Ligand binder design. Structure first.
Ligand SMILES: Nc1nc2c(ncn2[C@@H]2O[C@H](COP(=O)(O)O)[C@@H](O)[C@H]2O)c(=O)[nH]1
Ligand SMILES: O=c1ccn([C@@H]2O[C@H](COP(=O)(O)O)[C@@H](O)[C@H]2O)c(=O)[nH]1
Ligand SMILES: O=c1ccn([C@@H]2O[C@H](COP(=O)(O)O)[C@@H](O)[C@H]2O)c(=O)[nH]1
Ligand SMILES: [Mg+2]
Lengths: 71, 168
């Protein structure tokens, strides 16, 4: 199956937390603890509070996303 | 500073000034020496370049000591406060920030002028903004204590500010 309902929305990076879990003030609205993708981890790509990153957000509970695009 | 006293006066005729400001006129060297011996004071060469050299009867060591004292005292009320530098950061956070602020306050109280610097790394797109903002916030916090001197400035990989205490 692989049930695709994933919202591909952009957002400005807000708060740098541990584990590379970035609060991202989205273009959708409210900021959530959206963490970094595995791809990014592999390629060694540093995000700072001041970038417009794409966060792939879930419809079940908008509390956790995923930073996919580099800045 | 350095004067040629007693027997370092090779000069044949010397114009002699007494212990208090009494001008004893144009005298022989030997006579001057004798006079000095009589007072149990030194015969100092305070005017080596003047006609019949201006030679003073004084306690030379004491004078030297006084001079030294003067030099020393001057260099406290001329060294007279310095620059303390605090080096903040980008994603800087709560408790630490507060501590830094406290430190700054203490420095201001002491009397020492504050370089409010931030050392940077890379990704200089975000850098100017937040860095500037933090500095401004700090200034606002201490507008009850310090005057803004050097407003936001890049030094290459650095961003520096400067504050001075209000009433000095
Ligand atoms: N060229 C270079 N960049 C470095 C080095 N160490 C850290 N950096 C870079 O500096 C930034 C982080 O600075 P500090 O080392 O925290 C990152 O962009 C990182 O790549 C180094 O030795 N050489
Ligand atoms: O080789 C070095 C060491 C430190 N630094 C700077 O100093 C910071 C930390 O210092 P240390 O030496 O790890 C680092 O984030 C850089 O800004 C370099 O740029 N290169
Ligand atoms: O220790 C390190 C880490 C990254 N880099 C390189 O620097 C680039 C940018 O560094 P920063 O995280 O902005 C990064 O893409 C790497 O290619 C180093 O040169 N040294
Ligand atoms: Mg999916």
């Amino acid at each position: 199956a692989k049930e695709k309902d994933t919202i591909r929305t952009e957002g400005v990076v807000t708060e740098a937390l541990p584990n590379a879990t970035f609060r991202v003030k989205l273009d959708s609205g409210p900021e959530i603890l959206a963490y970094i993708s595995g791809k990014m981890r592999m390629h060694y790509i540093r995000i700072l509070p001041g970038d417009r990153v794409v966060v792939e957000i879930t419809p079940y509970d908008p509390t956790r996303g995923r930073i996919v695009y580099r800045k | 500073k350095e004067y040629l006293t007693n027997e370092r006066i090779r000069a044949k005729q010397v114009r002699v000034v007494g212990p208090d400001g009494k001008q004893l006129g144009i005298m022989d060297t030997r006579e001057a020496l004798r006079l000095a011996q009589e007072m149990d004071l030194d015969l100092v060469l305070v005017g080596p370049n003047a006609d019949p050299p201006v030679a003073r009867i004084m306690d030379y060591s004491k004078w030297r000591y006084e001079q030294q004292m003067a030099e020393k005292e001057a260099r406290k009320k001329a060294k007279r406060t310095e620059v303390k530098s605090i080096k903040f950061r980008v994603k800087i956070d709560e408790h630490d920030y507060q501590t830094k602020l406290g430190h700054i306050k203490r420095f201001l109280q002491e009397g020492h002028k504050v370089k409010v610097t931030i050392m940077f790394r890379g990704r200089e797109v975000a850098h100017p903004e937040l860095g500037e903002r933090i500095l401004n916030r700090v200034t606002e916090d201490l507008k009850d204590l310090a005057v803004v001197e050097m407003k936001p400035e890049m030094l290459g990989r650095d961003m520096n500010m400067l504050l001075a205490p209000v009433k000095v």
